[PDB]
Amino acid sequence: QANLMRLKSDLFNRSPMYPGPTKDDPLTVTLGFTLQDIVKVDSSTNEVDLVYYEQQRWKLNSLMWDPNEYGNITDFRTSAADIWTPDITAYSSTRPVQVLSPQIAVVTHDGSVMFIPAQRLSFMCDPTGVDSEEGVTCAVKFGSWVYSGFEIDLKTDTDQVDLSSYYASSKYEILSATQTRQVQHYSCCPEPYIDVNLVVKFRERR
Amino acid sequence: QANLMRLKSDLFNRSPMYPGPTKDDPLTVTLGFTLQDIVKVDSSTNEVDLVYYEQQRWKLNSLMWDPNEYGNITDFRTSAADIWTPDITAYSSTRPVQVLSPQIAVVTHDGSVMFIPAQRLSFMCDPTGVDSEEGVTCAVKFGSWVYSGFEIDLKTDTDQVDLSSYYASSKYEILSATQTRQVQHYSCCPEPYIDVNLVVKFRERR
Amino acid sequence: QANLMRLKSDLFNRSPMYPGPTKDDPLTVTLGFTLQDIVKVDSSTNEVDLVYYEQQRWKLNSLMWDPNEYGNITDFRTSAADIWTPDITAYSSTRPVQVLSPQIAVVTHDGSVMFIPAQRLSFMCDPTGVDSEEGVTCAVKFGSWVYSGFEIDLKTDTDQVDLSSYYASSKYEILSATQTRQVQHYSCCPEPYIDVNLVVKFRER
Amino acid sequence: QANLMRLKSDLFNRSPMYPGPTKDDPLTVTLGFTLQDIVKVDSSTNEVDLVYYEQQRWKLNSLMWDPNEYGNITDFRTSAADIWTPDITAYSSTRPVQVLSPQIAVVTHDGSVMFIPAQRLSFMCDPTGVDSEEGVTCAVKFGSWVYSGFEIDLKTDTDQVDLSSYYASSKYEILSATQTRQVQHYSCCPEPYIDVNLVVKFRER
Amino acid sequence: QANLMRLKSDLFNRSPMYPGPTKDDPLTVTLGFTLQDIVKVDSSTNEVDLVYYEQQRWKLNSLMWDPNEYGNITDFRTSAADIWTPDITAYSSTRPVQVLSPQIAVVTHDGSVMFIPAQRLSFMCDPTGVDSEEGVTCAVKFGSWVYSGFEIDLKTDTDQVDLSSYYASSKYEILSATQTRQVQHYSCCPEPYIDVNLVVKFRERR
Ligand SMILES: c1cnc2cc3c(cc2n1)[C@@H]1CNC[C@H]3C1
Ligand SMILES: c1cnc2cc3c(cc2n1)[C@@H]1CNC[C@H]3C1
Ligand SMILES: c1cnc2cc3c(cc2n1)[C@@H]1CNC[C@H]3C1
């Protein structure tokens, strides 16, 4: 501005879009969940509804630049449409995920992208024994839908889910939450697919 | 990398889109269902809700290339908008199907496309006797909406539906699931239309 | 394909889109309903939900061609966005209609288009007496929203609705179904508007 | 068609879009409601659902033409996207309005536009006493959201709402319906904003 | 209006879009809420639904002009798509916000923009004790999702929410409503993020 505008122009207008990773130049996405609320539980259909936001990080050479060339600009915000983004998907979802945040990411001079969408998800979960002291445990996998391990790998900075933002007066208390990496194989396809498995253990509030 | 982008450009930017099959150059789509959950049953309206993903395969000359000409590239992922896709449709649906996965397909050097959309479908089904030991049986046909047998044929690699991914703690147990090919005639039109008939037999979990 | 692609290109890329009918060059749409299910009935709000598919036919000179010029091609499928389509609308709908089928039509060398969208419609209907043996009767008009009789006419191949595809195990049995043409006048506008009136008579099982 | 296509092209392709009214060149929209059904009433949240269609008229110099120059064409239908339209909005709505009709308007040689969207609206209304003989009364204002009196004025051809199209077998009977013009002031802004206040009085039966 | 068209053309057609604020040229948005109705309360999931409209003001050099050059034009209305707008977001929302108004803003010769979207929001709130005389209190933060304090600051013209437009016959009476500015830090990010905290205290009508 004029610097930022020129920068954005150079990356997006002058180049073709990054065509996604491949076996030859694969990519690693760092996931991390901040759980906000277990909004509702349906014991007649065994689906439960979570609200959270999911931090995604990755890095691309396509998105690098030299700050001195662009008015000492270290980073910028941009629409998620302007860049490639990973197709992280909830495998046991029962309804399409609802986006609760804007679709804007941060890009930085070293090509690192950060993107943190807020979501509401309804996923498969049997709440039997939520009323008990012992509580009930449910799990849901997040991972690329189309990209194998050989193109997209996932990692977590910590197995502990971020519960510091959980709703004080929720109907359900969280006993524990876990974000652990996994490998899976499916009947369609020879290659392994990577996913981060979100496992929550919860119960009704006294 | 550059090597790909060039490929994608050659297939999509330089050519006009494949205009769909015709009697002269017809096409065969291979369908296959992985049932995930029978989410809910409504006995007051006789509609039942399934979550699954539906594997679609087909092949086009339009999409072929020579790997040596494109940096030894065997295959790639792309948006479903970038290519023609078949109009497989649930004939007894009561509500529009909801897409639970991204709209990305895999294309390969020999022109083979694979596309596996995850869906939630509400279809016509009378659950009377779901509580019994015997269970209740329901069926729904999938097939092209507009393309006759003479333009689109359907086939299955197996009559057995893939239940290996079914939800362990679902409200309903699957006794059996079947994907069998069928031929049908409709009053509008002289030609026969092909469909794969999904037949599931299920009951409450006891 | 080479042939078909060229054909499609000539009709759509090289010409401007058909700007809809007018008084001078009017047209006639043939409607026909295949009722599939009466899904639900709400007696607290007097709305009922139907699932069906609605066959639409019409013909345009804009869409004609000579098969010999295009590799003996008699007809083809295409997206509904690529062509003009008629604005048939349910006058007593209480919620926007939901499309249950793809938006693809068939065009033929003589300019005839066929298009059969599958729909779910919620329309105004008082089900009082649906539980009785006598059953209850409800009606809903379908017709162009903006085009008068003088631009769009409607006709039916038969007054009998196609119930051969109705759901065997539906909560409601169909006693009868009727698709009859009508003329209507509205206070806004001098001209008459045409509609096909769908009348169904049904009850619980 | 050739003629019509050329006309449409001249108005839309060759000109930039009408940039909306201003203080200097203000505009008057004529509103008129045809109420179809009071579909449902929720006494636990005090919202009620109406289905109707709302006639909008206005006139622009931008849209004028000479019929002799265009094959004696008096008028035509077109997409609502092709022209500017007014931002009439329900002030006491509790949910986004649902469009039940196509988005097509009629334009005429003297620059007059007519546009009649069918809608379902959920708005704020306490139904307490709907079961009584006396009935209950509710109101909802329609007016531009962003344009003051000084840019958009509203008028009504009649204070009587058009109930001739109301549903015979609705759960609720209409005792009366009124479309009266009003002026309002809001805390944000010095200028007055115009609205047409729809007031309905109704009950069960 | 020949004049207005030319003006609009000069700002939007001839220039590239304002690329959003940065640390170097930051921006201040003035928020203000007019609460219309507390429509419903769900005590089984602890979510409550508000209808309101939210006044947003800010100023940009990009949008300035000289009235003498454009037929003494002081201001104009335009689509929200034609200009940059701030990404104010409800942090404790449980469902995507629904827009109840048109997406039109007012721009003025000194570059000031005003934009007042009407919304329905479902947010996290425990209504326990709404039936009491004492009432129950709930809060929800509004702020940029992606822009730190260093790029977007928020302010309020008054801590008092505008209740003059509240629904006379609502199921719930408003005891008080507050729009107060706040600073927050999140685990992802070193910088502080600004939010205006909407705090309402209410009860059943009795
Ligand atoms: C870029 C993209 N998404 C973000 C999400 C958040 C934040 C910064 C972001 N930056 C913090 C503030 N906004 C909500 C969360 C936490
Ligand atoms: C290409 C395109 N679609 C796919 C869908 C799936 C898989 C691989 C795919 N590869 C497995 C993993 N993702 C969901 C399903 C099963
Ligand atoms: C052209 C356009 N739509 C059609 C819809 C159907 C059919 C033929 C069509 N042809 C029959 C077979 N497919 C579903 C319905 C009935």
Ligand SMILES: c1cnc2cc3c(cc2n1)[C@@H]1CNC[C@H]3C1
């Ligand atoms: C142009 C635009 N909208 C219209 C809406 C209607 C009519 C004519 C129209 N002409 C009458 C017939 N169609 C529904 C209503 C009433």
Ligand SMILES: c1cnc2cc3c(cc2n1)[C@@H]1CNC[C@H]3C1
């Ligand atoms: C520009 C943009 N949005 C506005 C919203 C409103 C108003 C003026 C506006 N001007 C007042 C009248 N319309 C609704 C609210 C209050």
